[PDB]
């Protein structure tokens, strides 16, 4: 898979070239990660990056016992339905 890094200073997981990313906001004393925006430029489409970015964010949340708000339409409309094994990470009140 493509190398994804965690850029805390920009609240994002991103490709190493910074061009594709998923941004988040932390809430509730660091217990909830709101995935607010996934961005893949058109020239980087077709590489699975949106999904790889989501996996990186979900793995981070899972490892840290953080729940997720899937605010981003990619996360909610595409990633989660296609990857339902990640659904338990979603804050229960979201769904
Ligand atoms: Br890349
Ligand atoms: Br890259
Ligand atoms: Br934050
Ligand atoms: Br917080
Ligand atoms: Br709480
Ligand atoms: Br935090
Ligand atoms: Br793609
Ligand atoms: Br993509
Ligand atoms: Br996906
Ligand atoms: Br799955
Ligand atoms: Br399902």
From Swiss-Prot:
CoA binds at residues 37-40, 46-51, 73-74, 78, 82. It is an enzyme of class 2 (transferase). Its EC number is 2.3.1.-. The keyword Acetylation applies. It is found in: Peroxisome. Residues 3-91 form the N-acetyltransferase domain. Keywords: Acetylation, Acyltransferase, Peroxisome, Transferase. GO terms for molecular function: histone acetyltransferase activity. GO terms for cellular component: peroxisome. Its main location: other. It comes from the Eukaryota. The active site is at 72 (nucleophile). Possesses in vitro histone acetyltransferase activity with histones H3 and H4. This is Acetyltransferase At1g77540.
